[PDB]
A = this chain, B = another copy of it.
């Protein structure tokens, strides 16, 4: 109920339809479990990271098979075939080449570490906001209006379950900005004046909860000429009859 009040829907609608909400939540959880069980190509990022690291190590190993202008790529052969003072040239060439390879590998590792650090910071702030609280930012914790968040641990990463609110099928209604009862403009406190065929009601923004127009739902202000689209109707007074 607190979450529903947070996303701008009155808390009573949750208590009116609790069983449906529980059934929908359970069905959605089962559906995503089945999707994870079936669709294998879902955890692309973690596999990409581990494959990238393995490929970097494998190519670093493979670099040893190239002679950087020397006569051979193995120190034992050079040392067996040549005297020290002249073989030192080939040894120096190989040393320079392998140092360059190591430096390149280290630099690429630094780049990847910086990118992973950025991703980790994003994950940390997402955990702080969406999981430990309710976020009013749009699309930060999933499409729709955010309600809850359940974290799960995955190797070299994290997966979030963003439980969200999505409005279903709608209807077409005729609306007016204000209502002129008796020479006085009236404006809705929280909702919008919606009119069906031959009646006027007031409803909340994100749900259809028709209500009769009373002095407790509207506040008076101004006159009946300034507003562009004012219409005539009647306002119920819940004190005069008594």
Contact = CB atoms under 8 A, between A and B. Distances in A.
Interface residues of A, number: 46
A139 interface: yes
What are the 3 tightest A-B residue pairs by CB atom distance, in nearest-first order?
Answer: A69-B92, A133-B138, A128-B139
Q: Which of A114, A133, A135, A138 has the most CB of B within 10 A?
A: A138
B69 A96 contact: yes
B68 A12 contact: no
A129 B138 contact: yes
Contacts of A36: none
Interface of A: 1-2, 10-12, 15-16, 18, 68-69, 88-89, 92, 95-96, 100, 103-104, 107, 110-111, 114-115, 117-118, 125, 128-129, 132-133, 135-140, 177-178, 185, 187, 205, 221-222, 226-228
A135 B132 contact: no
Given A12-B222, A15-B178, A135 B133 contact: no
Given A128-B139, A135-B137, A1 B114 contact: no
Contact of A15 (B100, B132, B177): B177
Contacts of A187: 11-12, 15
Nearest to A205: B2
B137 A228 contact: no
Contact of A111 (B11, B92, B103, B110): B110
Contacts of A137: 129, 133, 135
Contact of A228 (B15, B95, B104, B133): B15
Contact of A103 (B68, B104, B228): B104
B135 A15 contact: no
Nearest to A178: B15
B92 A227 contact: no
Nearest to A177: B15
Contacts of A226: 15-16
B16 A227 contact: yes
Contact of A12 (B107, B133, B138, B221): B221
A180 to B, nearest CB: 12
